[PDB]
Amino acid sequence: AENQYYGTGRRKSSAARVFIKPGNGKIVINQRSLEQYFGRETARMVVRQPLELVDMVEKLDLYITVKGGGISGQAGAIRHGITRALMEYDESLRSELRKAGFVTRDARQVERKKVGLRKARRRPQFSKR
Amino acid sequence: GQKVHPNGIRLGIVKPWNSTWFANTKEFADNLDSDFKVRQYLTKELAKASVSRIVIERPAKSIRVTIHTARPGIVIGKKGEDVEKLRKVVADIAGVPAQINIAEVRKPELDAKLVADSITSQLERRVMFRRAMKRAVQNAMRLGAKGIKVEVSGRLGGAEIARTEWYREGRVPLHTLRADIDYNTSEAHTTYGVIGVKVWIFKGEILGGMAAVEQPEKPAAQPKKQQRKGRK
Amino acid sequence: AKQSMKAREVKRVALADKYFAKRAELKAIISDVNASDEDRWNAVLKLQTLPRDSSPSRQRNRCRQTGRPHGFLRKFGLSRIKVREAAMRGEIPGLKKASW
Amino acid sequence: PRSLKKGPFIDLHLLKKVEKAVESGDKKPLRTWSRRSTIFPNMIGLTIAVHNGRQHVPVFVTDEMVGHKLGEFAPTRTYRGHAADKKAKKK
Amino acid sequence: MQNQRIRIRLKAFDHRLIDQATAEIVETAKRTGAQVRGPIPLPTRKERFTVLISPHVNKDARDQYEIRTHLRLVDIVEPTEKTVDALMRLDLAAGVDVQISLG
Amino acid sequence: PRRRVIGQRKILPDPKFGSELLAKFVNILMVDGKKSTAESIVYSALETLAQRSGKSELEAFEVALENVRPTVEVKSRRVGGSTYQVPVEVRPVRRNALAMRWIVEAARKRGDKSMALRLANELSDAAENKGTAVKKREDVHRMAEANKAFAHYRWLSLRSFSHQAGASSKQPALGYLN
RNA sequence: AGAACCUUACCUGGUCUUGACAUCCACGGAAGUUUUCAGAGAUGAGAAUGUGCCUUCGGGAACCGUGAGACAGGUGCUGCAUGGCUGUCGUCAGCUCGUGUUGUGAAAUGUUGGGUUAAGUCCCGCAACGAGCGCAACCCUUAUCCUUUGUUGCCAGCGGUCCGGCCGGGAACUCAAAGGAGACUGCCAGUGAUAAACUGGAGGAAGGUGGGGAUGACGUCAAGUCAUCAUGGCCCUUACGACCAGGGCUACACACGUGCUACAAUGGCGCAUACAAAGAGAAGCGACCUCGCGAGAGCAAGCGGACCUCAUAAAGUGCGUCGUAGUCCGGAUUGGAGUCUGCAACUCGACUCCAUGAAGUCGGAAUCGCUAGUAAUCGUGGAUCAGAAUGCCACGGUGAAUACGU
């Protein structure tokens, strides 16, 4: 039992911290408004796509803090982060969101820049003759 | 001739360094050049003893030497005068006054460096060396361990080319990241120029001999562990 | 390389370090805008023939073990080739192979 | 163009030779190696023989050169013309 | 939040040595005093070096080295003169330097 | 060649509509790794398509993607002193990827003052089978209908199967001469 | 890995020879410090402080000059004379150690056949047997996830409250560095020669030795370093030594390897706007401060580092603006002043901005990397670092086509 239930929104090594509870459908993103953060952007439709799918736009209340990523990318991280937090309206919720893929952590991990190579795999370029 | 040198990749897990001190970044060169000076001059005075390792350690206001030998008494010399002259030139070399303790003596008759020293002497003295390396390998596997590699170089027999030869027997892993495995390359001179022996020896695939602590903080150490969670 | 050229490089570097710490705000005081119709005096700058060697512009250090120029590393007091030789032999505290 | 910032230069090499040469008004070409060094009012009417790395070249000091260095008049490098390569240095 | 009263810091190259010395301090501080905390791990530093691998040439192949430096904070809320005495008698570590100086 | 069977990456439906056909499209719309712009360039494009006909946003997109579609590719596999050509059937996944690739190559030269307008306009033409990638479909089909004459190293391969307790017919499997 | 001078292997100019520097010996001077002037500076002439150290009280040593020797010194030559060490093939999928047999023996065999793998992995099996190397693994690192600390970290709620972890205070929460949890083609299904193994199934972050890395056999290749560093042969030792300065490798005839950034409009510009990671900083950077067109400047709280700063992180986002005209892209060159790091900005270092103002519109021969956090693309810090990154190292942002076929 808790004041807000919580999802960690881990997507491509960026983290959306996301606190869910029952209310009237309200958003706070980065101690500010949606207008400020995602101003005139498709990014508002990213975070809404899973919330429209379980049909609870006007029912879920939220508080959102996020570090790392690109702005279009942060919205993408939140889109898993809200569904990580949702687990207890019903028991099956976290199963069916994982099955829709919005619990699922981005299983591709970084590759180091390698020594003697100009990138991660990119071996040098030489015409030398 | 491929592969990284065998002790340099093992230092982050279960193998010690040949030196361990701390100098707070800015002074790390001043400590390294002085640590290299103790290695170079100290072992040079004890040339006449027999030695497997040198382990250098720096607490506050002290340099403490650990030294590894074929037997406990070789480095002590008569009534402690020989080892006091050793602590004499360390205090002189280092920026602090000097300490020395002798380590545990362990597997000294098959040990990497006490074997390599032993092989280099044969060549030094222009002895025939017809079996000498093959018997090095044999005696080492007769005294302990699980595998050995010996590679011998220095113009074998008096050839006017480079001419190496080698022998490995039992299990000697090459890409291993776990356990200490003991390697030494000796350098020494003879009539036709410089010679050298490479001794890789492998005692076991697991050694526990340096690790991070066993436990999470709460079950380790102090009974009353709990934080206030405010209360400045 | 040669030992005369190494002997020279080593003599520049202890006076570089010696003089330049004490000159840290002196550059601003004797030379730049804080010396507005102030200092700029021939009578303190006829003293600079010993300090030609003691200059920050000669605080390139090079090797502490060998005195050899170019490719230096101040944190070991060694250079590329000579760090590796020592790292092989375990001489340097904390030094390991990287994997990640 | 690049300049000398804010600070004061008299050059150590020139200073002891120039004091004793202005007392003469002018004397014999001053064996000078300091081709890093600027020209100053104190030096107007002197003759500075400026080592270029192989030998000295005499530089006549006068008001139209005081914006300028002893190393700008005394050469180093060579420009290869390409009828046939160049033997000589150019002032 | 807290304001740092005094800074107790352990700085080391060896990852294992700092972990043994902090745990010892945490005990010493409880064995001679009443107001201790579990040692904050504090973030570890890493410096990056790349060097040649052959003595001469072989530019492609290179070699890459890490040196780790581990920092612990402990955060005793109040050190007893006895905590500082005990710490200083039972010191023996080499891979770490402990600073009881502040900054 | 090749020790074992290897898979492929999979595109996963886009965040504004829930379509794999949209998410594969924006991916081939990506220029210098800058996807958040190629996103705006797709969503504005899809809205311009809704002003041309409002019953669906994809109206011209879907039908361009049938009409400029390749069915065939040309490969070459030597017969002695000559190379020749042998036509091959493409899988739907590459059939599409070729079409989408020609559609954006065609959008980048229309010269109009924003790519959202260019891409809506090159789909509007390529939908009627009037645009730029009709030619690319026709040329690749003219070689594929013509070059049905030649086949892959027939004379020795046919024997290389007949002797290894294979059939009197060419076996489509690794490290055999086919 | 940061070649003005020092950086010097090169080259030119001054100058001495037990020699820059150590040990050992003889004579004079303490070494050290401070200071004018000739000479580039070495060096020389004079001034002033001191007369330490040990003591047959003679005299010596430390150090400096002078001299005798022993001797230092040398990127000085030789890579088919070497050692130390490392590159290639190549992640080939093979290679070797102990032993027996078969041949007269070189040598074979194993190390080869079929099926399969990342694999000497595994089913079957022959005079190859027994076993190791590569590979598999522990391994670091990432990733969820369990797990603890709870600050210089964090803040669902609560107090002071502009509702900012600033602080009273709080553990739901990432979050740091670390014990580690999980995954084994093991399971169950299909396939597959019985079989290894592949692919599906399912719970989970994840199925394919979970991502990534470490990782690379014996060793030919006559690979390459005497120049980190060791060293015989082998040369100078009034020097292939050494004090002191200026010049160069970054020239200029040109060709050529590499990368950056641009050639647009998916973009460039202005104004406005958002979130990083990781690490470095005491000769240094640095809030606020006042000054300047700007660059910068002078002053200065502060900074062992999740304490302060580097830092405005950019790409991305908003709005308006631009039309193939080298422009509304791109803005290079150079005169001139203002500025910087430095006793020196001229050939070999950094920037502003005034005046004027070009090449480049996707590039011929040539030419390379990639199976996925990869390729592609953007910015940041660090190693070096007086000045100077297009580079290197690594970090975090954004992130693709397809793998039918040999």
Swiss-Prot record, chain A:
<comment type="similarity">
    <text>Belongs to the universal ribosomal protein uS9 family.</text>
</comment>
<keyword id="KW-0694">RNA-binding</keyword>
<dbReference type="InterPro" id="IPR020568">
    <property type="entry name" value="Ribosomal_Su5_D2-typ_SF"/>
</dbReference>
<dbReference type="GO" id="GO:0005829">
    <property type="term" value="C:cytosol"/>
</dbReference>
<dbReference type="InterPro" id="IPR000754">
    <property type="entry name" value="Ribosomal_uS9"/>
</dbReference>
<dbReference type="InterPro" id="IPR014721">
    <property type="entry name" value="Ribsml_uS5_D2-typ_fold_subgr"/>
</dbReference>
<dbReference type="InterPro" id="IPR023035">
    <property type="entry name" value="Ribosomal_uS9_bac/plastid"/>
</dbReference>
<dbReference type="GO" id="GO:0002181">
    <property type="term" value="P:cytoplasmic translation"/>
</dbReference>
<comment type="subunit">
    <text>Part of the 30S ribosomal subunit. Contacts 16S rRNA. Cross-links to the P site tRNA and weakly to the A site tRNA.</text>
</comment>
<dbReference type="InterPro" id="IPR020574">
    <property type="entry name" value="Ribosomal_uS9_CS"/>
</dbReference>
<keyword id="KW-0820">tRNA-binding</keyword>
<dbReference type="GO" id="GO:0022627">
    <property type="term" value="C:cytosolic small ribosomal subunit"/>
</dbReference>
Swiss-Prot record, chain B:
<comment type="function">
    <text>Binds the lower part of the 30S subunit head. Binds mRNA in the 70S ribosome, positioning it for translation.</text>
</comment>
<comment type="function">
    <text>Plays a role in mRNA unwinding by the ribosome, possibly by forming part of a processivity clamp.</text>
</comment>
<keyword id="KW-0694">RNA-binding</keyword>
<keyword id="KW-0699">rRNA-binding</keyword>
<dbReference type="GO" id="GO:0002181">
    <property type="term" value="P:cytoplasmic translation"/>
</dbReference>
<comment type="subunit">
    <text>Part of the 30S ribosomal subunit. Forms a tight complex with proteins uS10 and uS14. With proteins uS4 and uS5 encircles the mRNA as it enters the ribosome, which may play a role in mRNA helicase processivity. Some nascent polypeptide chains are able to cross-link to this protein in situ. In collided ribosomes contacts ribosome rescue factor SmrB.</text>
</comment>
<dbReference type="InterPro" id="IPR015946">
    <property type="entry name" value="KH_dom-like_a/b"/>
</dbReference>
<comment type="similarity">
    <text>Belongs to the universal ribosomal protein uS3 family.</text>
</comment>
<keyword id="KW-0687">Ribonucleoprotein</keyword>
<dbReference type="GO" id="GO:0019843">
    <property type="term" value="F:rRNA binding"/>
</dbReference>
<feature type="domain" description="KH type-2">
    <location>
        <begin position="38"/>
        <end position="106"/>
    </location>
</feature>
<dbReference type="InterPro" id="IPR009019">
    <property type="entry name" value="KH_sf_prok-type"/>
</dbReference>
Curated annotation (Swiss-Prot), chain D:
<dbReference type="InterPro" id="IPR005732">
    <property type="entry name" value="Ribosomal_uS19_bac-type"/>
</dbReference>
<comment type="function">
    <text>Protein S19 forms a complex with S13 that binds strongly to the 16S ribosomal RNA. Contacts the A site tRNA.</text>
</comment>
<dbReference type="GO" id="GO:0022627">
    <property type="term" value="C:cytosolic small ribosomal subunit"/>
</dbReference>
<dbReference type="GO" id="GO:0000028">
    <property type="term" value="P:ribosomal small subunit assembly"/>
</dbReference>
<comment type="similarity">
    <text>Belongs to the universal ribosomal protein uS19 family.</text>
</comment>
<keyword id="KW-0699">rRNA-binding</keyword>
<protein>
    <recommendedName>
        <fullName>Small ribosomal subunit protein uS19</fullName>
    </recommendedName>
</protein>
<dbReference type="GO" id="GO:0000049">
    <property type="term" value="F:tRNA binding"/>
</dbReference>
<dbReference type="GO" id="GO:0002181">
    <property type="term" value="P:cytoplasmic translation"/>
</dbReference>
<dbReference type="GO" id="GO:0003735">
    <property type="term" value="F:structural constituent of ribosome"/>
</dbReference>
<dbReference type="InterPro" id="IPR020934">
    <property type="entry name" value="Ribosomal_uS19_CS"/>
</dbReference>
<keyword id="KW-0820">tRNA-binding</keyword>
From Swiss-Prot, chain E:
<dbReference type="InterPro" id="IPR027486">
    <property type="entry name" value="Ribosomal_uS10_dom"/>
</dbReference>
<dbReference type="InterPro" id="IPR001848">
    <property type="entry name" value="Ribosomal_uS10"/>
</dbReference>
<protein>
    <recommendedName>
        <fullName>Small ribosomal subunit protein uS10</fullName>
    </recommendedName>
</protein>
<dbReference type="InterPro" id="IPR036838">
    <property type="entry name" value="Ribosomal_uS10_dom_sf"/>
</dbReference>
<dbReference type="GO" id="GO:0002181">
    <property type="term" value="P:cytoplasmic translation"/>
</dbReference>
<dbReference type="InterPro" id="IPR018268">
    <property type="entry name" value="Ribosomal_uS10_CS"/>
</dbReference>
<dbReference type="GO" id="GO:0000049">
    <property type="term" value="F:tRNA binding"/>
</dbReference>
<dbReference type="GO" id="GO:0032784">
    <property type="term" value="P:regulation of DNA-templated transcription elongation"/>
</dbReference>
<dbReference type="GO" id="GO:0042254">
    <property type="term" value="P:ribosome biogenesis"/>
</dbReference>
<dbReference type="Pfam" id="PF00338">
    <property type="entry name" value="Ribosomal_S10"/>
</dbReference>
<keyword id="KW-0804">Transcription</keyword>
<dbReference type="GO" id="GO:0001072">
    <property type="term" value="F:transcription antitermination factor activity, RNA binding"/>
</dbReference>
